[PDB]
DNA sequence: CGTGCGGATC
DNA sequence: GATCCGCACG
């Protein structure tokens, strides 16, 4: 496309991952993960951060554009 | 067992 | 703003 052949868009990372600059497991089903019992991707893990895709599911979902 | 950082390209 | 990616140390 344009920037899809270099990186990004593989599984969208956590809040702390975007700010820590790190890819991870917590995918588009991180929620369904908690459902099947998730915990914390490799990031939130090493830094006991906050594996979150919630504020996210409501952060990017809100507002227009 | 945590710790952070430069970049693709819009 | 977003996601991807590794790595070298104690
Ligand atoms: Zn993550
Ligand atoms: Zn996480």
Fold and architecture overview:
This protein has 65 residues and is mainly alpha-helical. It has one domain (1-65): Zn(2)-C6 fungal-type DNA-binding domain (CD2-Gal4, Irregular). Helices cover 35% and strands 0% of the residues. The longest helix has 6 residues, at 15-20. Residues 13-14, 17, 24, 26, 41, 43-44 line the site of one zinc ion. It binds a DNA duplex (10 and 10 nucleotides) through α1. Residues 5-35 are annotated as: Disordered. Residues 14-51 bind DNA. Residues 15-33 have a biased composition (Basic and acidic residues). Zn(2+) 1 binds at residues 14, 17, 24, 41. Positive regulatory protein for the ethanol regulon, alcA and aldA. It control positively its own expression and possibly in a negative fashion the expression of the gene coding for ADH-II.
Rounded radius of gyration (Å): 12 Å
Q: What is the assigned CATH homologous superfamily?
A: Zn(2)-C6 fungal-type DNA-binding domain
CATH top level is Few Secondary Structures
Distance between the termini: 21 Å
Number of domains: 1
CATH architecture: Irregular
Structural class: mainly alpha
In what range is the share of β-strand residues? Answer: under 5%
What is the CATH fold-level name? CD2-Gal4
Helical proportion?
A: 25-40%
Bound molecules: zinc ion
Main pleated sheet: none
Order of helices and strands: HHHH
Total E-strand runs: 0
Shape category: globular
Counted by DSSP, the helix tally is 4
DNA-binding region: 14-51
Region (Disordered): 5-35
Protein name: Regulatory protein alcR
Binding site for Zn(2+) 1: 14, 17, 24, 41
């Amino acid at each position: 496309g344009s920037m899809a052949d270099t990186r990004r868009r593989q599984n969208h990372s956590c809040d702390p991952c975007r700010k820590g600059k790190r890819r991870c497991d917590a995918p588009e089903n991180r929620n369904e993960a908690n459902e099947n019992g998730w915990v914390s991707c490799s990031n939130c893990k090493r830094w006991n951060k906050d594996c979150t895709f919630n504020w996210l599911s409501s952060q990017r979902s809100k507002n227009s554009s």
